[PDB]
Amino acid sequence: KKRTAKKNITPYQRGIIRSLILTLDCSEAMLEKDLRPNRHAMIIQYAIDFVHEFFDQNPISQMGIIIMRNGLAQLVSQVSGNPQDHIDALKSIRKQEPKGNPSLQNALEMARGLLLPVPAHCTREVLIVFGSLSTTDPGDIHQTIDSLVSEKIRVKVLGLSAQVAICKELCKATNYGDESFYKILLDETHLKELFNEAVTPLPVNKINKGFTLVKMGFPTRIFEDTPTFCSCHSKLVYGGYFCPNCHSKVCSLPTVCPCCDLMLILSTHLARSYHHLMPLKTFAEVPTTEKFRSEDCFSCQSRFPXXXXXXXXXXXXXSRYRCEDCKQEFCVDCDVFIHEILHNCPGCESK
Amino acid sequence: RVLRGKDDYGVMVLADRRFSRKRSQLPKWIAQGLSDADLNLSTDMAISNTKQFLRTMAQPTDPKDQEGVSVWSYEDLIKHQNSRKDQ
Amino acid sequence: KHSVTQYLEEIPQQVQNRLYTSPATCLAIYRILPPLAKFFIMAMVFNENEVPLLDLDKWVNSNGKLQFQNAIKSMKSLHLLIPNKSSGTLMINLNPTFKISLRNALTGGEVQNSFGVVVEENVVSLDLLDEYSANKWETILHFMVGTPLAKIPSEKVLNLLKHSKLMEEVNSTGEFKITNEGFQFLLQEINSQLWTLLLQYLKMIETSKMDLVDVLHFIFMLGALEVGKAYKIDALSETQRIMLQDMRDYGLVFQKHSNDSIFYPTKLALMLTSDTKTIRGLKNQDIPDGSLIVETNFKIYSYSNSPLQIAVLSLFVHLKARFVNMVLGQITRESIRRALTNGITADQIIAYLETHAHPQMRRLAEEKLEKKLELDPNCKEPLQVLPPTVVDQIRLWQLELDRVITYEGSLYSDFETSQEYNLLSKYAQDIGVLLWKDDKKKKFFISKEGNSQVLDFAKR
Amino acid sequence: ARARKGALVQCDPSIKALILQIDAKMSDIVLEELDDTHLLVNPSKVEFVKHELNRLLSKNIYNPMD
Amino acid sequence: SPSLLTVIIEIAPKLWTTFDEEGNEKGSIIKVLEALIVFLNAHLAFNSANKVAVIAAYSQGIKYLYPESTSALXXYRRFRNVDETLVEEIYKLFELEKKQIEQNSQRSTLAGAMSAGLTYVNRISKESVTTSLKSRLLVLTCGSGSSKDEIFQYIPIMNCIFSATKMKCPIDVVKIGGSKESTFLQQTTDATNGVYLHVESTEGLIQYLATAMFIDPSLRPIIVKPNHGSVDFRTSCYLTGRVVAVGFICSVCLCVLSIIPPGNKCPACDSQFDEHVIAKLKRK
Amino acid sequence: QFLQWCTLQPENCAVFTSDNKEMFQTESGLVVSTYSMVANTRNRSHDSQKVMDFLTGREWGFIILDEVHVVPAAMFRRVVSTIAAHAKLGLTATLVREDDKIGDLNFLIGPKLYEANWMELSQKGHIANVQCAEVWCPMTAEFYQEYLRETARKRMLLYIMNPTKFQACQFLIQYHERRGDKIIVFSDNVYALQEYALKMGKPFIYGSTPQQERMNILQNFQYNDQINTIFLSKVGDTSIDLPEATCLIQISSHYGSRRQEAQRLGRILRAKRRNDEGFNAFFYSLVSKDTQEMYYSTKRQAFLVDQGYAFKVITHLHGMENIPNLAYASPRERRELLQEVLLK
Ligand SMILES: [Zn+2]
Ligand SMILES: [Zn+2]
Ligand SMILES: [Zn+2]
Ligand SMILES: [Zn+2]
Ligand SMILES: [Zn+2]
């Protein structure tokens, strides 16, 4: 009995270039009380946490939000890479209470058009917050699902504590036949991990496709204060960035310059992808009988790691979760952080 | 009729007072599932009971290790275990 | 609290520079200097190059000079510097004793307290000699503050309670009751009780064998460096050793046995100087061992209690019975009124509840605070923090016990032209420095902070 | 830098009328009168202002609490 | 308002030894240590008993000095025990220095020690809920030639910046040696709001330490005094080595190159790009 | 008041009154009566005793009780023996009662099943968010002059007549009509209560009001929003139609005894099918301070919090001196009305 990653995520390809559009749902089903405040108020906040983390782990992507009220699919934020605008729309959604029922087919019709401006390199994905037990299809919903699979638009849905075949078929059909995106939620923590697992890339089997060699730029900082200006918003910007090509001022952000249309990234977009592409092997709990390490931690100083000859305390476990290749022991609290935010293994690096 | 395979699931609610006495007439596979704790429930509680059913059963709980006790994966656990059953 | 930093600024300049001569004392007073001054003190301590105030005005960012104004005013009030008007500017130079004192202490120096501590076999561990000091302090708490039993071994503690106003009871008869000085001292969480009573010990014994600077240097000496072996016996002057021996007998110092031994590391002086965890016949349970009672239903639910702790609570709540875990008491308008008749205004109990007796109010406030700092711009609905209903109950009751509201400040004049009164008033609203203003009478009753900064621009 | 220190006695006009009579009983210790709501008094005898106020409410009302 | 200053002073035979060769041999890293020691003493002095830590990095190993990791199983006298543990551990840490320490001259454990500091800070801040400490770490790097920009540890170093923003633990970088602006470190400070100070190695660091490394820990009320510009033109193309402003990112390979690659299967990944995809690139 | 919508039969359920005569000892079904009709000094004629005799020959199996506590229990045991009843049902209201004699009505009838959990019905939407208040109207000379001169109960209306109390009510008049709430005033007096709401110029409940007019006043009250203030007198209990309550104002604070207060507190504070405001059930106790009603009001202050309802104190209205109808605001005018109230 041990609950960790099985062997290792084989580092070959993961989806960093993406445009995931989550489709929320504000329906009278969400007026039914399942969560602590209600279905509607709670899910928004965990999507609010999802948005920042989604930008945190996939900063070269864009985000869009879709709501479903009164049997109609309604977008509140276009597919874009703006974290603050997405939250601002969700606040008004949070300010209001749900009514009606969700409309699956309209959202699927919305999803196809919405990700059409999404670039080829960005991996297509639409996230469905489907919680109710019925849809509203003004046509053949099997036709649009056939369009998304043919046009290579993978769909992962985040269902509530209910199981529907159409959503399961939708997940199976779009994701290259793979049926592994139908995890559902039953708790406050349970629904967040579905969002958190959507924050990370979702590889199952990458096919051989025509890969695109695309051109993107790196901006440069500014320092003027009294000459405060920017060519992106045309406001009193007391600090911003500049494209090396167009010389058109932009605020301090990864905002794409509106003059020559080349992608702008500072340091995070390349770096946040690098730790995603090649994950290390999980530091599994080294056996206490097979520890052969000193009574402390290695990455940090956690002297606690052995009860030693204390009945049901001794023969228990040990704070000695060691990395595989680096062969360095580490406490479970420490070794978890070793694979939580930054891999940065000490024994692996200290060589 | 509501269940098709092993994967199939769903609540089968029955609403009558005398169903308390007819626990004997229920089939043993169904009757075993009807413990003494499911007698004379409240339907709103049964709504909660199916609310919990909808919360628990709908989860994609596929441990794949507890399957083999009653799923007997392909041509492996049948030859391995049923030879012990020929006693 | 008697605000010793405002009392130490009243003592003349010669005795202030008397204290700065010890690098241990310079470090100890450095920890209590305001943080903006702390930056200024260390800055001028390192390079002793005279610089006009204009350049120092360039160093810092925008508004926030209120710390700067109070710091330099404090610096002059306690005369840690000497303002020298050379070129019409402020050539602020640190006091020669204070400037030189921090040189050693910051660079591993020989401060008389810092290096006077003797490293030896510290038989007095963290729990060594502190439990007796806490009990001796506990005894002086029952005698001075007023408790069921006054078992304090400090006879000078009781005497200082009467004449020095440490105990609000019959000083002549030897009793320690709760009075205006006692309520103010006990209202302070830690510093107010320690600072107010300690002043009586210094003020009373301050001329004959007292050694004002000598007793202070020894008190700063104990916090200057850990006494260890030969600490209390050694790191104590004629006034210090008598004070330390008096502290050893009176609970002021955690000395060893026989009234003459090494300084055991008691936590009482650490509590006064570092102002850190106040948790200490050999059982020392903390921190949440103590606790109090507060409720929206106007009923106290106590489950953890301490002997002296309930004595303070019962002074402002009706005491009926003590159980294994529960103490009977019902907080209402009547309950606070018990101490309100005695003249103790219901001001320091509000801070008392959220600072002490809260270890049993942890979960009750755990639904109060709700992390209303980052989400404060997001959500504006408080979850009852700080408690307004009990505040409404107390303020209504305290107002009844007074029926008159008195405000403190200083009246001003010379508002000849209407423009000057309005311009300061509007900015006063931004800072909340004006209690009330009127253009018709051109007079208001507030402190000097509004007056001082306007003249600062006028003068500079 | 001008400063004129003292104690301010302020309340609603009805209570203010009662208070001014109270201080008038001890040779009008009130230093100055700014207006109908604010009274500048020397902080020496303010405790006497409230103590005489305490007597008159107890002497007259006697707290019948009927 | 205590802060946790986790000292990470790297002693890399590749980087540390070359300091004697450049300029003149007028002293060792002892001032680099001792100015950091007293700055640790001064840091220990300003706040009310603010915990600290000292970590060093060989070229092929790491070890703590002040925290005094498990091996067995005057003035306030606390600055002594900080130094007493320091001088005792730094001796046995220096004692574990030989050819094996210098063996991995291509490798660098300074990234590991910086990783060690983040883990040590993370564990300390996790457990120390009482009296929360606004921790920050300071790394003094031996500015020396023959390794101006290494490429294999590029991934771990840029990831460390995230935690500094994530855990609110600013990384302070001081370059100690010749005028080689470490671009990864030149940008780590600005990205994590720390301090870059390519100070002269021999200069008594406390004057810089007390000025430019005293604002970040807990107060931050005043203008910091950084090094020169923080231009946002990132690393060079891996295939060629030329600094690029408008880069050419290949694919999920994520390597950003110049126009040098033939438009398919760059020498960083085995992915045959579409021929028409190269044609669009060649169309400009 | 309610039983018409109920499917029970009014013609068969002969309303026994002993003064108006209906059909008795002849009903084939259920009947509705009172304890006073059963056996008390309120035996207006021998008709009541004829019902009692028939209740023995007829084997009556169930008896529904409505507020037994007003009638002493001694008659309860006397009637039971002769009636030879099978089972009963005492639908009382008060936890503490005078009917705790040797024969407990609980064991006389049977074990209790459910308790009057008022915190459940005053928080679930009918009367949810009970904001009980006690208005301490600012004092003046004449109230202090009236307190010292006379301490008899004749003063009970000499502190009720406070013009600031009416103005404190007038804040609740303007605030709640602006909020679309319901305002209920409770005043056992008649003449001074009538003098109250003429000034604001609105229809209002008053002492010995014509019944058709008062329900017409109620017609504009809970159906219309322009008229929302109703001044219930002692004619309200017991008993009349207890109205839907959103803001209840009590002026009389003696109202002996405390057991009546628990019934009256539960009675007038009734279901309100409205949830726009966060506090959909206000309660206000307009009590003159430094007057006799200190003790009586402070009994209510402990009473509401002991009943479980949430409590507050409203002493500072939002702009008290700027509210309309500033009649009798000055201290001189208040004294003049106090002498007029001496007539009552
Ligand atoms: Zn802009
Ligand atoms: Zn551009
Ligand atoms: Zn490893
Ligand atoms: Zn660890
Ligand atoms: Zn590549």
Swiss-Prot record, chain D:
Family to which the UniProt record says this protein belongs: Belongs to the TFB5 family.
Q: What is the lineage of its organism?
A: Eukaryota, Fungi, Dikarya, Ascomycota, Saccharomycotina
Q: Name one GO biological process term.
A: transcription initiation at RNA polymerase II promoter
Report the InterPro entries cross-referenced here. TFB5-like_sf (IPR035935), TFIIH_TTDA/Tfb5 (IPR009400)
What does the annotation say about its assembly with partners? Component of the 7-subunit TFIIH core complex composed of XPB/SSL2, XPD/RAD3, SSL1, TFB1, TFB2, TFB4 and TFB5, which is active in NER. The core complex associates with the 3-subunit CTD-kinase module TFIIK composed of CCL1, KIN28 and TFB3 to form the 10-subunit holoenzyme (holo-TFIIH) active in transcription. An additionnal subunit, TFB6, plays a role in the dissociation of the SSL2 helicase from TFIIH after transcription initiation. Interacts with TFB2.
Q: Its biological function?
A: Component of the general transcription and DNA repair factor IIH (TFIIH) core complex, which is involved in general and transcription-coupled nucleotide excision repair (NER) of damaged DNA and, when complexed to TFIIK, in RNA transcription by RNA polymerase II. In NER, TFIIH acts by opening DNA around the lesion to allow the excision of the damaged oligonucleotide and its replacement by a new DNA fragment. In transcription, TFIIH has an essential role in transcription initiation.
The record's PANTHER family line, in alphabetical order, gives: GENERAL TRANSCRIPTION FACTOR IIH SUBUNIT 5
Provide the alphabetized UniProt keywords.
DNA damage, DNA repair, Nucleus, Transcription, Transcription regulation
Q: Which SMART domains match?
A: Tbf5
Organism superkingdom: Eukaryota
Gene3D superfamilies of this UniProt entry? TFB5-like
Classification via SUPFAM superfamilies:
TFB5-like
User: Where does this protein reside within or beyond the cell?
Assistant: Nucleus
Spell out the GO cellular component terms annotated for this protein, sorted alphabetically and separated by semicolons: cytosol; nucleus; transcription factor TFIIH core complex; transcription factor TFIIH holo complex
Q: Does the keyword Aminoacyl-tRNA synthetase apply?
A: no
Q: What is this protein called?
A: General transcription and DNA repair factor IIH subunit TFB5
Q: Tell me the Pfam families matching this sequence.
A: Tfb5
From Swiss-Prot, chain F:
Transmembrane segments in this chain: where?
none
Q: Where in the cell is it found?
A: Nucleus
Q: Enumerate the spans annotated as Helicase C-terminal domain.
A: 167-321
Consequence the record notes for mutating W5L: In suppressor mutant
Q: Where is this motif: DEAH box?
A: 66-69
Where the record annotates domain Helicase ATP-binding, the positions are 1-113
As stated in the Swiss-Prot or TrEMBL entry, residues carrying the post-translational modification Phosphoserine are S330
Q: Which cysteines in this chain are paired by disulphide bridges?
A: none
Instruction: Give the observed phenotype of the deletion mutant.
Output: Essential, it cannot be deleted; epistasis studies suggest it is involved in damaged DNA excision repair.
Q: What does this protein do?
A: ATP-dependent DNA translocase. Component of the general transcription and DNA repair factor IIH (TFIIH) core complex. When complexed to CDK-activating kinase (CAK), involved in RNA transcription by RNA polymerase II. May have 3'-5' helicase activity alone, the TFIIH core however has no 3'-5' helicase activity. Also involved in transcription-coupled nucleotide excision repair (NER) of damaged DNA. In NER, TFIIH acts by opening DNA around the lesion to allow the excision of the damaged oligonucleotide and its replacement by a new DNA fragment.
Q: In which family does this protein belong, per the annotation?
A: Belongs to the helicase family. RAD25/XPB subfamily.
Miscellaneous field? Present with 825 molecules/cell in log phase SD medium.
- Subunit structure, interactors included: Component of the 7-subunit TFIIH core complex composed of XPB/SSL2, XPD/RAD3, SSL1, TFB1, TFB2, TFB4 and TFB5, which is active in NER. The core complex associates with the 3-subunit CTD-kinase module TFIIK composed of CCL1, KIN28 and TFB3 to form the 10-subunit holoenzyme (holo-TFIIH) active in transcription. An additionnal subunit, TFB6, plays a role in the dissociation of the SSL2 helicase from TFIIH after transcription initiation. Interacts directly with TFB6.
Protein name (record): General transcription and DNA repair factor IIH helicase/translocase subunit XPB/SSL2
Biological classification of the source: Eukaryota, Fungi, Dikarya, Ascomycota, Saccharomycotina
The part of the entire sequence present here spans: 423 to 766 of 843
